[PDB]
Structure 1
Amino acid sequence: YGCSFESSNPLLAIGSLSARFGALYWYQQRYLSDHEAVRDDRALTKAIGHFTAWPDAFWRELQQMVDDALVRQTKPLNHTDFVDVFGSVVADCRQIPMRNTGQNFILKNLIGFLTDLVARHPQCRVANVGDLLLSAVDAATLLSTSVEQVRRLHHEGFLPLSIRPASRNTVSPHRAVFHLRHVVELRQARMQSHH
């Protein structure tokens, strides 16, 4: 009904109401997968405790699935889709309606993590994590901008395309084609703002 908080240590304890609503919606689909039992009070009541160690737990949830994915590998990683390892955790960032990083704190932590992941895995002769392919709609989300802007950014040569398409065809938004390390670096280099 209102916020009214002070000494807001948890990442769920600050902000405008729309964000506070979005954070709960996200928590629910992701951890309350059990079918509705109209436990309208009890089901959501737990979300606050959950977030109290967030700055240090979210990363472990992401780390766990890097390893479980790795041991099930069937192709060299540089032809593997980003989605096969992280399971659309990126798309879920779109459920909070705000676009910028300083307000959408879920996206802010996911990017933090991916930047570190790339940093500890530099390029060498054998491919490794960080060379995964992103689709056009994924870069748009990580770069905090609409899709048409990515097409314009490609056209000017600020980033490379890795898969050669056939002639008399087009690459659709859903096709996986940019390397992760290329997107992370470009964003640090030329996409920052006061937000």
Structure 2
Amino acid sequence: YGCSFESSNPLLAIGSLSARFGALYWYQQRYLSDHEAVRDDRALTKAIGHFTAWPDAFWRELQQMVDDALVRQTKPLNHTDFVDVFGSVVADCRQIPMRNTGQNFILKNLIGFLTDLVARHPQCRVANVGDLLLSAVDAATLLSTSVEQVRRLHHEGFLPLSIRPASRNTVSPHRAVFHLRHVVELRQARMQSHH
């Protein structure tokens, strides 16, 4: 009904109401997968405790699935889709309606993590994590901008395309084609703002 908080240590304890609503919606689909039992009070009541160690737990949830994915590998990683390892955790960032990083704190932590992941895995002769392919709609989300802007950014040569398409065809938004390390670096280099 209102916020009214002070000494807001948890990442769920600050902000405008729309964000506070979005954070709960996200928590629910992701951890309350059990079918509705109209436990309208009890089901959501737990979300606050959950977030109290967030700055240090979210990363472990992401780390766990890097390893479980790795041991099930069937192709060299540089032809593997980003989605096969992280399971659309990126798309879920779109459920909070705000676009910028300083307000959408879920996206802010996911990017933090990916930047570190790339940093500890530099390029060498054998491919490794960080060379995964992103689709056009994924870069748009990580770069905090609409899709048409990515097409314009490609056209000017600020980033490379890795898969050669056939002639008399087009690459659709859903096709996986940019390397992760290329997107992370470009964003640090030329996409920052006061937000």
Q: TM-score range by the shorter chain?
A: over 0.9
CA distance in 2, matches of 1:165, 1:194: 38
CA distance in 2, matches of 1:188, 1:83: 22
Distance 1:65 1:185 in 2: 23
Whole-angstrom CA distance in 2 between matches of 1:17 and 1:79: 42
State the shift of 1:187 in Å.
0.0
Output one character per residue of 1:24-77: Cα deviation in whole Å (capped at 9) or x when no partner. Answer: 000000000000000000000000000000000000000000000000000000
Task: After TM superposition, give the deviation of residue 151 of structure 1 in Å.
Answer: 0.0
Q: CA deviation at 1:98?
A: 0.0
- Whether 1:78 and 2:72 are equivalent positions in the alignment is no
User: For 2:138 and 2:3, how far apart are their aligned partners in 1?
Assistant: 33
Report the CA distance between 1:118 and its aligned residue: 0.0
By how many angstroms is 1:143 displaced?
0.0
State the shift of 1:121 in Å.
Answer: 0.0
Q: CA deviation at 1:78?
A: 0.0
Q: CA deviation at 1:170?
A: 0.0
How far, CA to CA, are the matches of 2:52 and 2:46 in structure 1? 11
Q: Deviations over 1:87-134 (max 9, x none)?
A: 000000000000000000000000000000000000000000000000
Q: CA deviation at 1:160?
A: 0.0
Name the counterpart of 1:135.
135
Following the alignment from structure 1 to structure 2, what is the Cα–Cα distance between the partners of residues 159 and 178? 8
Query: What's the % identity of the aligned pairs?
Result: 100
Q: Which runs of 4+ in 1 moved over 3 A?
A: none
Aligned partners of 1:64 and 1:102: how far apart in 2? 26
What is the alpha-carbon distance in structure 2 between the residues aligned to residue 14 and residue 4 of structure 1?
9
> SS at 2:148's partner residue?
helix
Aligned mates of 1:107, 1:143 — CA distance in 2: 11
TM-score (normalizing by structure 1): 1.00
Distance, in Å, in 2 between the alignment partners of 1:49 and 1:5 is 16
Mapped partners of 1:156, 1:184: distance in 2: 18
Q: 1:18, 1:125 → 2: CA distance? A: 47
Match of 2:116 in 1: 116
Shift of residue 5, structure 1, vs aligned partner: 0.0
Distance in 1 between the 2:140 and 2:115 partners?
A: 16
The count of residues paired between Structure 1 and Structure 2 equals 195
Q: CA deviation at 1:149?
A: 0.0
How far 1:190 moved relative to its partner? 0.0
User: Residue 50 of structure 2 aligns with which residue?
Assistant: 50
Q: CA deviation at 1:11?
A: 0.0
The CA distance in 2 between the partners of 1:143 and 1:99, in whole Å, is 10
**TM-fit CA distance, 1:192:** 0.0
Q: Helix, strand or coil: the match of 2:123?
A: coil
SS at match of 2:69: helix
Secondary structure of 1:5's counterpart equals: coil
1:154, CA displacement in angstroms? 0.0
Distance in structure 2 (CA, Å) of the matches to 1:29 and 1:115: 26
